[PDB]
Amino acid sequence: MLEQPYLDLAKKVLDEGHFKPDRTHTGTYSIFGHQMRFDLSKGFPLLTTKKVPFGLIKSELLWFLHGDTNIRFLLQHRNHIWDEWAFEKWVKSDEYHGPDMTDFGHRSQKDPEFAAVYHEEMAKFDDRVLHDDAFAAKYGDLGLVYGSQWRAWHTSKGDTIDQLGDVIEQIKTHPYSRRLIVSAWNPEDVPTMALPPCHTLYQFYVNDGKLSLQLYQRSADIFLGVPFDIASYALLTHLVAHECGLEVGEFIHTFGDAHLYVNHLDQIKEQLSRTPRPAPTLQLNPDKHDIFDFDMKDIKLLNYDPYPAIKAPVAV
Amino acid sequence: MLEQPYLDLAKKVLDEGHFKPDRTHTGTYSIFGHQMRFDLSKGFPLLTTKKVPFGLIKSELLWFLHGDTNIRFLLQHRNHIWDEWAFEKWVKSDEYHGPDMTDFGHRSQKDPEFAAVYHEEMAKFDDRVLHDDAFAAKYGDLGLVYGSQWRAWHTSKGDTIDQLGDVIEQIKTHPYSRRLIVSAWNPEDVPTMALPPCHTLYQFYVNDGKLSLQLYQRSADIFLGVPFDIASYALLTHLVAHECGLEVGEFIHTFGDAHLYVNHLDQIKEQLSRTPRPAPTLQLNPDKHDIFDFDMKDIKLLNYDPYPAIKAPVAV
Ligand SMILES: O=c1ccn([C@H]2C[C@H](O)[C@@H](COP(=O)(O)O)O2)c(=O)[nH]1
Numbered sequence: 159m160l161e162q163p164y165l166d167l168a169k170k171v172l173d174e175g176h177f178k179p180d181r182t183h184t185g186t187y188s189i190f191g192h193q194m195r196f197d198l199s200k201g202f203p204l205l206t207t208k209k210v211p212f213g214l215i216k217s218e219l220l221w222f223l224h225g226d227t228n229i230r231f232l233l234q235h236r237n238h239i240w241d242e243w244a245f246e247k248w249v250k251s252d253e254y255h256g257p258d259m260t261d262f263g264h265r266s267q268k269d270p271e272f273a274a275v276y277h278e279e280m281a282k283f284d285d286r287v288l289h290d291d292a293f294a295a296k297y298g299d300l301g302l303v304y305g306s307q308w309r310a311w312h313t314s315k316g317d318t319i320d321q322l323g324d325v326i327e328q329i330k331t332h333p334y335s336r337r338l339i340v341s342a343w344n345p346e347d348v349p350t351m352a353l354p355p356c357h358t359l360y361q362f363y364v365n366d367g368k369l370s371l372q373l374y375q376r377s378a379d380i381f382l383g384v385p386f387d388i389a390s391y392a393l394l395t396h397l398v399a400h401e402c403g404l405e406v407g408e409f410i411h412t413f414g415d416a417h418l419y420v421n422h423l424d425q426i427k428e429q430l431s432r433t434p435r436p437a438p439t440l441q442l443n444p445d446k447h448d449i450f451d452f453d454m455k456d457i458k459l460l461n462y463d464p465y466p467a468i469k470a471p472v473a474v
Numbered sequence: 475m476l477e478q479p480y481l482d483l484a485k486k487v488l489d490e491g492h493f494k495p496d497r498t499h500t501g502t503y504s505i506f507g508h509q510m511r512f513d514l515s516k517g518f519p520l521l522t523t524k525k526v527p528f529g530l531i532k533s534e535l536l537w538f539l540h541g542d543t544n545i546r547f548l549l550q551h552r553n554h555i556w557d558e559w560a561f562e563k564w565v566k567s568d569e570y571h572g573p574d575m576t577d578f579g580h581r582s583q584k585d586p587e588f589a590a591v592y593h594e595e596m597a598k599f600d601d602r603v604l605h606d607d608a609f610a611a612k613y614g615d616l617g618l619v620y621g622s623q624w625r626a627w628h629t630s631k632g633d634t635i636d637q638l639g640d641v642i643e644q645i646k647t648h649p650y651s652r653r654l655i656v657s658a659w660n661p662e663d664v665p666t667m668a669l670p671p672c673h674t675l676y677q678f679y680v681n682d683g684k685l686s687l688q689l690y691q692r693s694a695d696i697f698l699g700v701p702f703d704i705a706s707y708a709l710l711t712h713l714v715a716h717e718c719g720l721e722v723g724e725f726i727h728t729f730g731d732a733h734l735y736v737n738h739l740d741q742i743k744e745q746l747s748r749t750p751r752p753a754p755t756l757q758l759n760p761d762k763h764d765i766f767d768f769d770m771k772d773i774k775l776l777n778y779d780p781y782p783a784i785k786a787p788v789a790v
């Protein structure tokens with residue numbers, strides 16, 4: 159089966175994994191150095207062993223492709239993946255006036271009444287970013303995030319570099335280039351950053367008219383993280399191939415610190431008892447070819463018949 | 475055996491490898507995405523199936539560790555690995571007055587008389603960089619190279635960042651940091667560069683008091699390149715572990731475009747018929763602990779009993 163590598167990864171972590179502590183107060187079972195690949199011509203690696211919201215994936219990837227760093231776009235598609243980070247900026251602001259939302263997330267798990275308070279404060283925030291253009295510009299903009307790293311890498315002289323843009327051009331004019339890399343990691347920012355890029359770097363490769371892509375991920379959450387991560391990138395491989403008029407090859411996922419939080423042991427175990435099902439299929443608008451102008455209506459996922467979803471507490 | 479992974483890599487390329495063209499006018503047999511690891515507590519992965527000059531490795535690594543970008547240091551240790559690049563700058567200069575050294579290297583293979591001329595011009599260059607301080611400062615300095623990337627990453631405001639320096643500090647104060655990355659890849663330079671870093675990025679990891687390191691290499695020459703590359707990094711893992719007072723773990727080598735030039739087929743084949751021998755051992759000066767101040771006399775390689783060397787034409 160196509161998703162077998164993921165399940166393989168999960169079991170391995172359950173065996174060779176060593177308990178290692180981390181910043182998120184929850185014990186983890188980690189592994190350093192792991193590589194798995196997916197032949198994209200066999201199917202789209204969206205997990206069938208647990209329902210994975212392709213919608214959130216599609217819209218978040220498009221957010222990146224546009225070079226957008228503002229949460230507003232995400233919110234208008236019912237994608238709250240990036241809310242937490244923008245909300246922090248808001249609550250730590252002097253312009254903020256409301257209940258002490260300190261250590262929230264951690265504080266939510268341990269305080270049901272506070273949680274409803276917190277969730278209400280958030281509801282306000284999302285609303286204002288969606289309506290108050292100044293507020294959005296002032297608190298909805300993440301600034302340093304994948305879109306600005308991928309497409310607006312600030313040069314040491316005011317300029318901005320569109321990494322992805324040039325790479326895609328290099329792929330057309332020089333398919334056999336061993337230098338087709340896009341990096342999300344910038345040393346100057348890394349220390350002054352809330353969350354340095356989990357998706358550190360990726361490389362495209364062309365051979366026999368098929369386009370492959372490899373991703374180096376310094377840190378990964380086996381349960382909650384990896385399923386979305388495999389999706390975002392197997393899709394990006396398709397997207398770039400679609401533009402460049404190339405066939406799709408393999409998606410190679412290389413890990414640094416692959417880890418399973420101890421509070422997801424039962425869940426990952428249950429998912430493991432499930433038998434995968436045939437992989438879904440991707441369908442990209444044949445007319446439209448410039449991926450930067452794509453929209454939700456352009457990417458179709460046929461035949462995705464997943465198993466039921468699995469609820470697991472996020473670690474924080 | 476410890477070097478088995480290398481030989482495994484070689485065979486695989488000879489089988490699953492697909493002919494792919496490249497910039498260096500010689501056909502190659504490539505593979506995209508490959509990972510191999512070496513348990514350093516079993517031995518130092520210096521190839522025993524062919525004599526590999528550990529001297530060149532040791533001195534080049536120290537060059538990096540010092541944050542030195544000038545060829546002069548290398549030349550005073552009989553290390554000419556980096557001559558070619560500095561020589562180019564010289565011959566393309568207006569201050570240069572001598573025979574047209576265009577397309578040399580390629581031109582050398584095809585022109586014996588010219589080769590002796592070229593080799594003589596070089597002899598002059600090396601001599602002057604070693605003696606003429608102004609000339610060294612003007613033509614011996616590579617500028618953008620591993621030492622300046624590792625330790626003098628220029629910030630977008632005049633400053634300079636000592637990546638390695640901080641990481642090593644982070645390893646001591648936060649061993650379990652999943653963010654222990656040093657990147658050699660800078661988007662602003664990459665287009666304006668003679669040779670964008672082959673050794674793109676690396677990550678340290680700490681668990682059970684053992685220090686492991688993973689390297690992402692976008693491009694690799696299986697025959698001539700990989701043996702030195704495994705050495706430089708397995709050593710660096712030792713060096714950083716020595717400083718941080720940690721045990722040594724594994725060295726994980728992840729490849730992007732692993733390739734074997736078609737003119738090394740016979741040689742790699744011959745090397746393959748050889749049986750590996752017990753791995754050598756590293757010995758680092760127990761007193762001296764700050765690796766940045768290390769010198770040749772500090773790193774000892776015990777019991778290295780290699781097979782004879784293998785001559786193979788460099789591809790260019
Ligand atoms: O899609 C994603 C986003 C984040 N992470 C994870 C990795 C870690 O679980 C946590 C980051 O920890 P640090 O390495 O930055 O400390 O977020 C993923 O695996 N997948």
Ligand SMILES: O=c1ccn([C@H]2C[C@H](O)[C@@H](COP(=O)(O)O)O2)c(=O)[nH]1
Pocket residue numbers: 336337497669670672693694695696698699700702703
């Ligand atoms: O120690 C080294 C130095 C360089 N390279 C190689 C990789 C390619 O053979 C060539 C660079 O080709 P490009 O990818 O930059 O085009 O140099 C190595 O493998 N090992």
